[PDB]
């Protein structure tokens, strides 16, 4: 099954894990669990702790007030491992118990029940001038020998793992999104009617987005150009909400419509990261390291409430605009399929 692991620099403490990308089912998050292998003969301190940290680190235009980069732990939980805590009488998982068999009595378990609504692992694309730690929401697992919480943990006997919380496309589709707008003009009460629709609700990354358009112009004005673009919003809400605003792909057609005429064609947008590198602040899916990752997949809020979700929330919608100007926006979902 190929479990992971990490060994403390001194080699005294090591933490095992079954997987590092924990799926989110909208309402529950898979329980982070594993084991820690410790030896009492080198652990006179008599405590081996594990710490799950849901760090949120943010940049943006704070540099002008000096390097005021800040981070706030949106969620922290701890568990005592080497001295078995009496209250943690929770049955082991298959992975934990089979690892215990593999390892013997010198390993101890742990597990964190991450609650829902915690932001998904998301990274914001750094600008070329940024060189510090990449900003965004991330998760991290700590394990350290110690004697109490107040004492600062030594790098010598600490292990740092970075996991990520991941969300996958629903097993069933939504409704075919559609949107239309009717405009009236000072010349006369004669409408300019614009419609737009997409092929399907959920689009996997890299899959083309087919936009179905229809325009009916009964006015004397001429639609000089047709602007169609797909844009990404990232709702940043730590203390008070703020809105991001960033296109990711655009097609500009010089198509027009004569007075009292109709027009209809299908376009094909396809978001991709190749040409969007320069856009600082763009949302990318959470990385496990300084690797390359696709555009941040949409986030599925828990239930219909969607109230008080911290961190970064990403969502997409495609804008159809006519340069008479008239525009309409149409939402869609952009996330990977569930791997087999």
């Amino acid at each position, epitope marked *: 099954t*190929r479990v992971f692991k990490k060994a403390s620099p001194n080699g005294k403490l090591t933490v095992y894990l079954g997987k590092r990308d924990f799926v989110d089912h909208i309402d529950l998050v898979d329980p982070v669990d594993g084991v820690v292998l410790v030896d009492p003969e080198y652990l006179k301190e008599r405590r081996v702790y594990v710490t799950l940290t849901c760090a949120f680190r943010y940049g943006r235009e704070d540099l002008d007030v000096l390097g005021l980069t800040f981070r706030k732990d949106l969620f922290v939980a701890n568990v005592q491992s080497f001295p078995p805590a009496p209250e943690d009488k929770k049955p082991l998982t298959r992975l934990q118990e089979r690892l215990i068999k593999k390892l013997g009595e010198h390993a101890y378990p742990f597990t964190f029940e991450i609650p829902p609504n915690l932001p998904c692992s998301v990274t914001l694309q750094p600008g070329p001038e940024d060189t510090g730690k990449a900003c965004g929401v991330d998760y991290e697992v700590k394990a350290f020998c110690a004697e109490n919480l107040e004492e600062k943990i030594h790098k010598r006997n600490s292990v740092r793992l970075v996991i990520r919380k991941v969300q996958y496309a629903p097993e069933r589709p939504g409704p075919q999104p559609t949107a239309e707008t009717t405009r009236q003009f000072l010349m006369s009460d004669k409408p300019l009617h614009l419609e737009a629709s997409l092929d399907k609700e959920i689009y996997y*990354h*890299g899959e*083309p987005i087919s936009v179905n358009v229809h325009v009916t112009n009964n006015t004397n004005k001429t639609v000089k150009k047709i602007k169609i673009s797909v844009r990404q919003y990232a709702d940043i809400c730590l203390f008070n909400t703020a809105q991001y605003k960033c296109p990711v792909a655009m097609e500009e057609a010089d198509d027009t419509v004569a007075p009292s005429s109709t027009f209809c064609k299908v376009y094909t947008l*396809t978001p*991709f990261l*190749a*040409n969007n590198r320069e856009k600082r602040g763009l949302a990318l899916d959470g990385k496990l390291k300084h690797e390359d990752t*696709n555009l941040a997949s949409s986030t599925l809020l828990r239930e219909g409430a969607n109230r008080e979700i911290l961190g970064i929330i990403v969502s997409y919608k495609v804008k159809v605009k006519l340069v008479v100007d008239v525009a309409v926006e149409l939402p869609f979902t952009l996330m990977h399929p569930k791997p087999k």
Partner: antibody
Framework: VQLVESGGGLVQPGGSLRLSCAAS????????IHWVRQAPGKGLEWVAS????????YYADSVKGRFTISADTSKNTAYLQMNSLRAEDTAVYYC?????????????WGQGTLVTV | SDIQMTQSPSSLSASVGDRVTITCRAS??????VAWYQQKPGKAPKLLIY???SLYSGVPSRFSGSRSGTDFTLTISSLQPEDFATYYC?????????FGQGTKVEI
């Protein structure tokens, strides 16, 4: 569903030839196209690759700089430009497709035009 | 860097119904990133196994993979008259993707 490949021929050393891999049934943005040759009677060797989603292009050491790979995304066909051909380059040039999210082997293959010296 | 996939045996034979195993060692730890190909004489290869254990769609169940450290194995549960071909071992954890030398199976 399949990959249609064409553009083979014969070119003496110092010549240049162009191969094309016309995809069908998937976009070059959700996929990465790899050119995987096979010398006559020898084993496979990967010679170039393109991943349009990120824009990276990778070349084998034996063809570093000599070759150039590109693909227009409007018609989702990938081209490979070979320059200064040599005798050791004679081979079949199967085109192939690797899932972009994420790599899982070259599941779809072209048909392997020829190249000769 | 280069990762020589020393595949062996470079040739073998077995009757129909006999179980056959092909071994492929990676000159460096490539994790579980290996795939196995079947190339009929003169035609384009075909993918069978990926991730060194996963069975592709369509391929018969007779093909099964396995891993042990840097040693990878492909085993055919019962060789059939249409299984005689050249099989190639491929790793894909590091670019450049490197293929084995192949093992022609003979009647």
């Amino acid at each position: 569903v399949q990959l249609v490949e064409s553009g083979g021929g014969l070119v003496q050393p110092g010549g240049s030839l162009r191969l094309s891999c016309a995809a069908s049934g998937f976009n070059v943005y959700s996929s990465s196209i790899h050119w995987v040759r096979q010398a006559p009677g020898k084993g496979l060797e990967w010679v170039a690759s393109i991943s349009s989603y990120y824009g990276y292009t990778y070349y084998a050491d034996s063809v570093k700089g000599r070759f150039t790979i590109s693909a227009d995304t409007s018609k989702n066909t990938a081209y490979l430009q070979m320059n200064s051909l040599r005798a050791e380059d004679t081979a079949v040039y199967y085109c192939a497709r690797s899932r972009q999210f994420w790599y899982s082997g070259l599941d779809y293959w072209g048909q392997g035009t020829l190249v000769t010296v | 860097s280069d990762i020589q996939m020393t595949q062996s045996p470079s040739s073998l034979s077995a009757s129909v119904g006999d179980r056959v195993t092909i071994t492929c060692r990676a000159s460096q730890s490539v994790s579980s990133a290996v795939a196995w190909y079947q190339q009929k004489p003169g035609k384009a290869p075909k993918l069978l196994i990926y991730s060194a254990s996963s069975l592709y769609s369509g391929v018969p169940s007779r093909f099964s993979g396995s891993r042990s450290g840097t040693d990878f194995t492909l085993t055919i549960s019962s060789l059939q008259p249409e299984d005689f071909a050249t099989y190639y071992c491929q790793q894909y954890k590091y670019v450049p993707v490197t293929f084995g030398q192949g093992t022609k199976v003979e009647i």
